[PDB]
Amino acid sequence: GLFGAIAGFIEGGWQGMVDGWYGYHHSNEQGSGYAADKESTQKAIDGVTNKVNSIIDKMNTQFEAVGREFNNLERRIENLNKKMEDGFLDVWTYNAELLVLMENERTLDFHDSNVKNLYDKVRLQLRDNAKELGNGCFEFYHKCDNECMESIRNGTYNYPQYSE
Amino acid sequence: KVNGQSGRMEFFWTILKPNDAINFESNGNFIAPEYAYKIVKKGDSAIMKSELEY
Ligand SMILES: *[C@@H]1O[C@H](CO)[C@@H](O)[C@H](O)[C@H]1NC(C)=O
């Protein structure tokens, strides 16, 4: 995407994650396991919900074309009415389509931003105790069990662990 | 001749306010009113040019 995470430096998405748009997949002696980073998913869910609410409520006074009947010698005023209603409906269709397109753009890029930001959050803690394998994974230079991974998830990784 | 009848009837309409009066006078060609319509309930409505049934 615009930030390079989705279909970028991370190859593709995990079918095995069902409870979050983003997450971790840890593998140590205590097994492997997926986990959802709930907080970032909630940021994204709020984003999308507020976007849908905005789309619904920002065009809640659009235009209502009520019908007016005219005789045969009021062709001018009838045509005025006709092309007026036509023009209003055209401009409001334009507005709806632009909103839909621009929001699709911003939303896809928002998700990309969230993935890149999560990768950066992990990297900024793991600074030197680990090494980037280039595709979204981090190799731990020390031994660290499931509570290590939990401290990484909730954001409290303790840097003093000897790593050689 | 329209419907085999050449003569033409032209109808007019008005709306009397409460407590007011209307006065007709004539000496010919008077298609006089026999009924009228009280406007008992305004509202929000429309006229729909459609062909469907109910
Ligand atoms: C109609 O009758 C009322 C009596 O209830 C009278 O006051 C009023 O003046 C009459 N209308 C006109 C136009 O005079």
TrEMBL record, chain A:
<comment type="subunit">
    <text>Homotrimer of disulfide-linked HA1-HA2.</text>
</comment>
<protein>
    <recommendedName>
        <fullName>Hemagglutinin</fullName>
    </recommendedName>
</protein>
<comment type="similarity">
    <text>Belongs to the influenza viruses hemagglutinin family.</text>
</comment>
<feature type="coiled-coil region">
    <location>
        <begin position="56"/>
        <end position="90"/>
    </location>
</feature>
<feature type="disulfide bond">
    <location>
        <begin position="144"/>
        <end position="148"/>
    </location>
</feature>
<comment type="function">
    <text>Binds to sialic acid-containing receptors on the cell surface, bringing about the attachment of the virus particle to the cell. This attachment induces virion internalization either through clathrin-dependent endocytosis or through clathrin- and caveolin-independent pathway. Plays a major role in the determination of host range restriction and virulence. Class I viral fusion protein. Responsible for penetration of the virus into the cell cytoplasm by mediating the fusion of the membrane of the endocytosed virus particle with the endosomal membrane.</text>
</comment>
<comment type="function">
    <text>Binds to sialic acid-containing receptors on the cell surface, bringing about the attachment of the virus particle to the cell. This attachment induces virion internalization of about two third of the virus particles through clathrin-dependent endocytosis and about one third through a clathrin- and caveolin-independent pathway. Plays a major role in the determination of host range restriction and virulence. Class I viral fusion protein.</text>
</comment>
TrEMBL record, chain B:
<comment type="similarity">
    <text>Belongs to the influenza viruses hemagglutinin family.</text>
</comment>
<comment type="function">
    <text>Binds to sialic acid-containing receptors on the cell surface, bringing about the attachment of the virus particle to the cell. This attachment induces virion internalization of about two third of the virus particles through clathrin-dependent endocytosis and about one third through a clathrin- and caveolin-independent pathway. Plays a major role in the determination of host range restriction and virulence. Class I viral fusion protein.</text>
</comment>
<comment type="subunit">
    <text>Homotrimer of disulfide-linked HA1-HA2.</text>
</comment>
<protein>
    <recommendedName>
        <fullName>Hemagglutinin</fullName>
    </recommendedName>
</protein>
